[PDB]
Design goal:
- Helices cover 19% and strands 29% of the residues.
- The protein has a single domain, classed as Alpha-Beta Complex (Phosphoenolpyruvate Carboxykinase, domain 3), CATH 3.90.228.10.
- The strands form 2 sheets. The chain has a 5-stranded antiparallel β-sheet with strand order 1-2-9-5-3, with helices on both faces. A 4-stranded mixed β-sheet has the order 4-8-7-6.
- The chain contains 4 helices and 9 strands; from the N terminus they run βαβαβαβαβββββ.
- By secondary structure, the chain is α+β, with helices and mostly antiparallel strands.
- It is globular and about 50 Å long.
- The protein has helices spanning 12-23, 52-67, 85-91, 114-118, and strands at 3-6, 41-50, 75-80, 108-111, 143-151, 155-160, 171-176, 185-188, 194-204.
- The protein binds 4-(4-OXO-1,4-dihydroquinazolin-2-yl)benzonitrile (27F) and zinc ion.
- This is Poly [ADP-ribose] polymerase tankyrase-2.
- It is found in: Cytoplasm; Golgi apparatus membrane; Nucleus; Chromosome, Telomere.
């Protein structure tokens, strides 16, 4: 049921998604080990992910959460990187897309920093890097990330350096407590709480 609609680079929607991609790059504590060395991306394509059944699955859950939280879904747009991006856009998020070993338990993880999600494009820790060159810092190969609509509801705040949500909460927020430049990361424990709105195709760019 999924169709992908290309956005034009002239479209304000392309431009605002690109700006969120580019402006949320940061340096990582691994010096680029997992995701590569870069300060910015070459955006090759942005597509809207259109699936009526998956969208209705998301909105149904969003209303349930909203009604449990004084009519506030606490909806965000966040990045997701995964080797399973193709399955996700076709079948939706579910338990098979969870980070079993994540620091907030087995759930589906999202990031404010696009460069954080970029570390997972080729697997946990960047895996063995790109299929073609086995390079986690490949500047040639095309990568994909999702920019997703995510319902957080009442989020459990974890200060720090599938399972169930903590009782009385709908998500977990991983607040950065050491690296002053890191943005928040978030975990949901029901795949119905995220919709993969945009598929972004890009390369990381070698710094000059
Ligand atoms: N298998 C698998 C698997 C796929 C994706 C991730 C993943 N983790 C993150 C952890 C923190 C912040 C963001 C992410 C993310 O975008 N993605 C983790 C594991
Ligand atoms: Zn490559």
């Amino acid at each position: 049921g999924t169709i992908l609609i290309d956005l034009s680079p002239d479209d304000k929607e392309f431009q605002s998604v690109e700006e969120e991609m580019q402006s949320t790059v940061r340096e990582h504590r691994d010096g680029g080990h997992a995701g590569g060395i870069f300060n910015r991306y070459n955006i090759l394509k942005i597509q809207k992910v259109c699936n009526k059944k998956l969208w209705e699955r998301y909105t149904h859950r969003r209303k349930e959460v909203s009604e449990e939280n004084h009519n506030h879904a606490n909806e965000r747009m966040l990045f997701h990187g995964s080797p399973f991006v193709n399955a996700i856009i076709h079948k939706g998020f579910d338990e098979r897309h969870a980070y079993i070993g994540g620091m907030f338990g087995a759930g589906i993880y999202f990031a404010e920093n696009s460069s954080k999600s970029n570390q997972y494009v080729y697997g946990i820790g960047g895996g063995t890097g790109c299929p073609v060159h086995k390079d986690r810092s490949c500047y040639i190969c095309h990568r994909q990330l999702l920019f997703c609509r995510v319902t957080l509801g009442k989020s459990f705040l974890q200060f720090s350096a599938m399972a169930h949500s903590p009782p009385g909460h709908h998500s977990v927020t991983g607040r950065p407590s050491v690296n002053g430049l890191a943005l928040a990361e978030y975990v949901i424990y029901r795949g119905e709480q995220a919709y993969p709105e945009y598929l972004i195709t890009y390369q990381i760019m070698r710094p000059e």
